[PDB]
Design a binder for this molecule. Structure first.
Ligand SMILES: [Mg+2]
Ligand SMILES: [Mg+2]
Lengths: 80, 81
């Protein structure tokens, strides 16, 4: 399986990161907030764990959403 | 439970210092250190090693200490493996 990560940056609004986590990773508001804070403080955080193709899909959906909303948010994946 | 130690890319820390860190604190061969350094540059983040919780914390701390004493903002953290 493969974990999907988001990386911190100084441009993407916190509220957008929460939105991404809720929408694309089905996080509750509190859990999304938790992960958003963790990424802000530590530079990176885990959004979910999926089979390879599904991880690729989620990474792509996040990047598509971010860029269309004019945010440079970086999303990537690693073997879990 | 084991924990992976990660570094994050930045635009300031020199490539050669990252290789030095990988060799000094994570027992990487020159080739592996170079490849991880390049991977982090390309991907934004990369895995330095996997250790028990407290050893991972120790490595993270040693990297931050070394980086700041070398005048570099290199970010290092850990996650459950
Ligand atoms: Mg694992
Ligand atoms: Mg990771």
């Amino acid at each position: 399986l493969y974990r999907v990560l988001i990386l911190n940056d100084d441009y993407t609004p916190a509220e957008f990161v929460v939105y991404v986590l809720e929408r694309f990773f089905n996080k509750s508001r509190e859990d999304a907030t938790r992960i958003m804070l963790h990424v802000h403080q530590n530079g990176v955080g885990v959004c979910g764990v999926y089979t390879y193709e599904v991880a690729e899909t989620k990474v792509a959906q996040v990047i598509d959403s971010a860029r269309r909303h004019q945010h440079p948010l970086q999303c990537t994946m690693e073997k879990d």
